[PDB]
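quick one: octyl beta-D-glucopyranoside bound model?
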Amino acid sequence: ELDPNALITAGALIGGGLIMGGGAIGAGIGDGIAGNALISGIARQPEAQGRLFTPFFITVGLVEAAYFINLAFMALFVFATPGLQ
Amino acid sequence: MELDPNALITAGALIGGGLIMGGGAIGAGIGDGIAGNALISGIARQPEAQGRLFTPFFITVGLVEAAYFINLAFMALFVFATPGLQ
Amino acid sequence: ELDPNALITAGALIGGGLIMGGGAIGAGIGDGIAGNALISGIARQPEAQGRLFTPFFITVGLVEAAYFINLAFMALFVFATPGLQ
Amino acid sequence: ELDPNALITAGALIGGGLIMGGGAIGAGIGDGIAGNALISGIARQPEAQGRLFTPFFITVGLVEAAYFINLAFMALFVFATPGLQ
Amino acid sequence: MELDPNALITAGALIGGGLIMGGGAIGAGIGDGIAGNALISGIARQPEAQGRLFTPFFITVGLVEAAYFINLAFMALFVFATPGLQ
Amino acid sequence: ELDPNALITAGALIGGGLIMGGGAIGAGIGDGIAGNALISGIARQPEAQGRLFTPFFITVGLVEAAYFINLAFMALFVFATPGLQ
Amino acid sequence: ELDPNALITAGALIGGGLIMGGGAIGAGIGDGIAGNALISGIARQPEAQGRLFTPFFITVGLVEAAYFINLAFMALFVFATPGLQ
Amino acid sequence: MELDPNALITAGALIGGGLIMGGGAIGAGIGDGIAGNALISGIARQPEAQGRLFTPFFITVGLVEAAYFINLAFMALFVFATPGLQ
Amino acid sequence: ELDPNALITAGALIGGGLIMGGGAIGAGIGDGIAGNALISGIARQPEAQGRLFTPFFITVGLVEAAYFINLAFMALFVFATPGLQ
Ligand SMILES: CCCCCCCCO[C@@H]1O[C@H](CO)[C@@H](O)[C@H](O)[C@H]1O
Ligand SMILES: CCCCCCCCO[C@@H]1O[C@H](CO)[C@@H](O)[C@H](O)[C@H]1O
Ligand SMILES: CCCCCCCCO[C@@H]1O[C@H](CO)[C@@H](O)[C@H](O)[C@H]1O
Ligand SMILES: CCCCCCCCO[C@@H]1O[C@H](CO)[C@@H](O)[C@H](O)[C@H]1O
Ligand SMILES: CCCCCCCCO[C@@H]1O[C@H](CO)[C@@H](O)[C@H](O)[C@H]1O
Ligand SMILES: CCCCCCCCO[C@@H]1O[C@H](CO)[C@@H](O)[C@H](O)[C@H]1O
Ligand SMILES: CCCCCCCCO[C@@H]1O[C@H](CO)[C@@H](O)[C@H](O)[C@H]1O
Ligand SMILES: CCCCCCCCO[C@@H]1O[C@H](CO)[C@@H](O)[C@H](O)[C@H]1O
Ligand SMILES: CCCCCCCCO[C@@H]1O[C@H](CO)[C@@H](O)[C@H](O)[C@H]1O
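yep, here:
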């Protein structure tokens, strides 16, 4: 006993998992790489501490936009599954 | 037990759409973090730069985001207008 | 012999595993990259220790947010599976 | 109830998604890494802007060639599926 | 031909547990190698550091290993106490 | 209704997608990393601009060889599928 | 003709493959990155050759611990499969 | 509906061969790009080197390519002589 | 029509492919990263060639150990499949 939505919903959960698994790879590594520059810049140029946070937050904003746009589509896949029967 | 052809096709479409956007976010998050790493370091080294660094930064981010959003458009095709649906 | 929730739960477990596998890739590598800058920065200048831990912990907080938001959605997938019949 | 093209088209969509997911990982990260050198190079020496955009655009052209050759084969897989019955 | 519901659920649990630990080791191996890269370089540059480098090194490795072992705990949940088993 | 080649062909398209998805990850990131050195070298040593292109094209040639050998095997998988029935 | 353990065992081999495939990605890249620092440190500071091996082996030990703990769980999955019927 | 055992085995072989070569090209493309990055930078810094840099470059590329071609040989085994075919 | 070993062998081949795909990612990238330090080190100081090959070959030995231990378990999976019926 199966029904079509069992297979569609399984596909939706696997697809949603790929969306969020990739989002976290991009966000964790992209934010780490941005922070690496912030930390090194402050070590090299202490007086710049305050001004380095502006390009840092621009960068984190871009990185997090990918994470949260992915999250929104994961939510679509698993709560409003396109093609559900 | 009941399946139909579109149950399998739609499951494949969702998995494929998920691969498209999972890979898009890996490329966008890491590419934008690497571009921003250089912006931050460049401003730390040459604070007077700033102005001349944001043009190359925006060109780089534009290229990275183009991959993200072209992928997003094809994810949308896969899941809202699946090619090969029966 | 199968039933619809057997296939849905299998998809939920694979999807939850993708979510946490990607979370740990982003957290382990992003935290390592942040820490690389902290360690290098302190090596270059021992008196900067305090001032470097602040951007380090901001970076780690961002990286860990990805990890734990993913963990929450893994828990949703496997304990309150969206689409279970 | 299934037919052979249902399984073939499912495989084509998964395969097309792998092609484009890998294309974007290579394009986003390769373009980011190229741009990192462009930005750093201009920071070090503002008068080098023109001369650095030339190798940058050569690099981006190579990276984008991978992306768009992959995109063409994704289109082959999902619109003119090889092996469709 | 005989399957039962738990055959499918347990196969999904094992694949999911494998993803959890495969990703955990990718993050732990590369994160710990990157942390150690800085420890090694820092000692090459400032051999008298040593002492002051091991505290940031251990904090970094502790964070990386926390991801590895939290993942391991959920792999164990997935395969020894599978949620949703019938 | 299925037939054996439906499953074989689905496998071939997924395998071909893995081959090209991995090829583009390797090519986009490898070419970006090669170009990063080209751009930085020209920034550091402008007079070397012309001579840096020789090791650059050797490197890109190696990277692209992996991409195109993969492409050839993807073509084999999906147009001349080994094991087709 | 299938039986439940055929599907469980297939899942166990795929899960074991993911465990060891991820372990080798982490170990090969983590050890390479550790060795990069060892080689560069010796190039920069020849007299330090002997003392750099201590932090190097600490680092490799951590990296290999992930590899071999993964190996042990792969062995569990494929030789003492949890949930086997 | 008709399947036979080799349809499933051959589908697994093709997916497995694809993983082998997808991973081979990831390792070869990025490893060769990283090796070449050092060759290019080394020649930028020490143009008179050149000669002494190509031996370590070729040893490194030889190691990277060995992984690529050993993988290729096993992909060929998987898909042209599948172990376990019935 | 199927039999249990058809599904087990399919899982073994996918699992063996994961093992070798991950082995080559770790070996190619880890060896490239080691070699990057060797090449840079010799560029900086040609007389250090001999002394840099020693840590290079230690690093490569570690990286290759991951590759070949994985290769051995791939061979176990596909030639002496654990759980074959
Ligand atoms: C939706 C796309 C948003 C991209 C980020 C843009 C944020 C604003 O970027 C601005 O650009 C200026 C150049 O005129 C810089 O000098 C400023 O520091 C910066 O705030
Ligand atoms: C969630 C994980 C956080 C771990 C925090 C461990 C405590 C680190 O604490 C740090 O110790 C330094 C001395 O080494 C001080 O100079 C810093 O100000 C302090 O933040
Ligand atoms: C879950 C996200 C955790 C990270 C949020 C951290 C926000 C920190 O905010 C920052 O604090 C700095 C302290 O010096 C200031 O210099 C900056 O101006 C300020 O933006
Ligand atoms: C396909 C994406 C290409 C984007 C190109 C954007 C235009 C960049 O144009 C660049 O502007 C520089 C000044 O900032 C000039 O010095 C360079 O010569 C010029 O190429
Ligand atoms: C799709 C591939 C796009 C990249 C192809 C770029 C080929 C550029 O070719 C290069 O042009 C340089 C310009 O200074 C010259 O210095 C080099 O000698 C020449 O090889
Ligand atoms: C199980 C966790 C093991 C983590 C590695 C710890 C190995 C011992 O680490 C020791 O720490 C000292 C600080 O007191 C350093 O000065 C020594 O060089 C080091 O041997
Ligand atoms: C099939 C394997 C091809 C590997 C690339 C080799 C390309 C030729 O490499 C040559 O090696 C010389 C050393 O004698 C270098 O000095 C030259 O710059 C280079 O052209
Ligand atoms: C398993 C792959 C190992 C390849 C080893 C190739 C031989 C490299 O041999 C190296 O040659 C150098 C000169 O270039 C010598 O200075 C080194 O001492 C020597 O180890
Ligand atoms: C399969 C694993 C291969 C790598 C094992 C290499 C062990 C080398 O051992 C090292 O040899 C060095 C030579 O200078 C010494 O300086 C170190 O003290 C010693 O620990």
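Residues 1-85 of chain F form a domain with the F1FO ATP Synthase fold (CATH 1.20.20.10).
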